[PDB]
Structures are given as structure tokens and as C-alpha cells.
Design a protein around this ligand. Structure first.
Ligand SMILES: Cc1cn([C@H]2C[C@H](OP(=O)(O)O)[C@@H](COP(=O)(O)O)O2)c(=O)[nH]c1=O
Ligand SMILES: [Ca+2]
Length: 129
């Protein structure tokens, strides 16, 4: 896998963000996670977490996995990095997302994320409280 550049257009919620990628606007859905919807418990906290992380970043990068790069809704599917830190992992580490939507061939970072979820669960963080 490799990182590619992108720029923030807009934070949307905990697990979706609008980015300019190869010069085109695209909504991205973060791989291998599920944040609560804004209207659910921890939804606002997930959205705010992702928003800060991507808005504060000097450099956003996306990393596609080895399978499908767009979902059925036309959303990009990627791992996202804010000054080199993975947003997808950071959400799970904080108990603001669950590992989810683990599909064959787009699962390169599954066990990394599961390890973060286990530490979040141990700490009874947010969703795991
Ligand atoms: C994360 C992810 C979601 N999706 C689709 C599956 C779900 O379909 P359904 O809408 O039919 O439930 C939906 C979940 O996204 P959200 O959690 O953003 O709703 O997005 C993928 O197809 N691939 C993925 O890698
Ligand atoms: Ca969601």
C-alpha cells in the first residue's frame, strides 16, 4: 500500500470526510471502521474527533487498500492519515469507532485496528463504557 496526497474540503462526520483527491472532490468513507451516526450516542464526539484531526493536519494522505476503491454510493474507500497518524486507527483507539465492514481484500490494516479496539475496550473508553 502507498500514501497519496489529498486536501481537506470538509469534515462530514466521524467516518466520512470530503477531500480533494487528484484534483476532484470526493466523499471518502474510512475503511474498517464504524462511527456512530451524529444522532447516536458518541456520534457528536466522533465527528468532532475526526474534524479536529483532519482540520488541524498540515498534510492529509489517503491510502487505498488492494480491493475496491469506491463503494456502492460512490464514496472513496481509504485509510486516512493526518500528519502521518491514521485517523481510522485513532478513532478505534479512543473508543469512538468499532472495527467493522471488514471485507476480504480491503483488510490490510485489520489486525492493527483490532489491537487498538482491544486497548480501547480494556480502558472502557467512550463506546466501551
Ligand atoms: C466501510 C464500507 C461501507 N460500505 C457500505 C456498506 C453499507 O451498505 P448499507 O448502506 O447498504 O448498509 C454502508 C455502511 O456505511 P455507513 O456506516 O457510512 O452507513 O456502506 C462498503 O460497501 N464498503 C466499505 O468498505
Ligand atoms: Ca457510520
Amino acid at each position: 500500500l502507498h500514501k497519496e496526497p489529498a486536501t481537506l474540503i470538509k469534515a462530514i462526520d466521524g467516518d466520512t470526510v470530503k477531500l480533494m483527491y487528484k484534483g476532484q472532490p470526493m466523499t471518502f468513507r474510512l475503511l474498517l471502521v464504524d462511527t456512530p451516526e451524529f444522532n447516536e450516542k458518541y456520534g457528536p464526539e466522533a465527528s468532532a474527533f475526526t474534524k479536529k484531526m483532519v482540520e488541524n493536519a498540515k498534510k492529509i494522505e489517503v491510502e487505498f487498500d488492494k480491493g475496491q476503491r469506491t463503494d456502492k454510493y460512490g464514496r472513496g474507500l481509504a485509510y486516512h492519515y493526518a500528519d502521518g497518524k491514521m485517523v481510522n486507527e485513532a478513532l478505534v483507539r479512543q473508543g469512538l469507532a468499532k472495527v467493522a465492514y471488514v471485507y476480504k481484500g480491503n483488510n490490510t490494516h485489520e489486525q492493527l485496528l483490532r489491537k487498538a479496539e482491544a486497548q480501547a475496550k480494556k480502558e472502557k473508553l467512550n463506546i466501551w463504557s
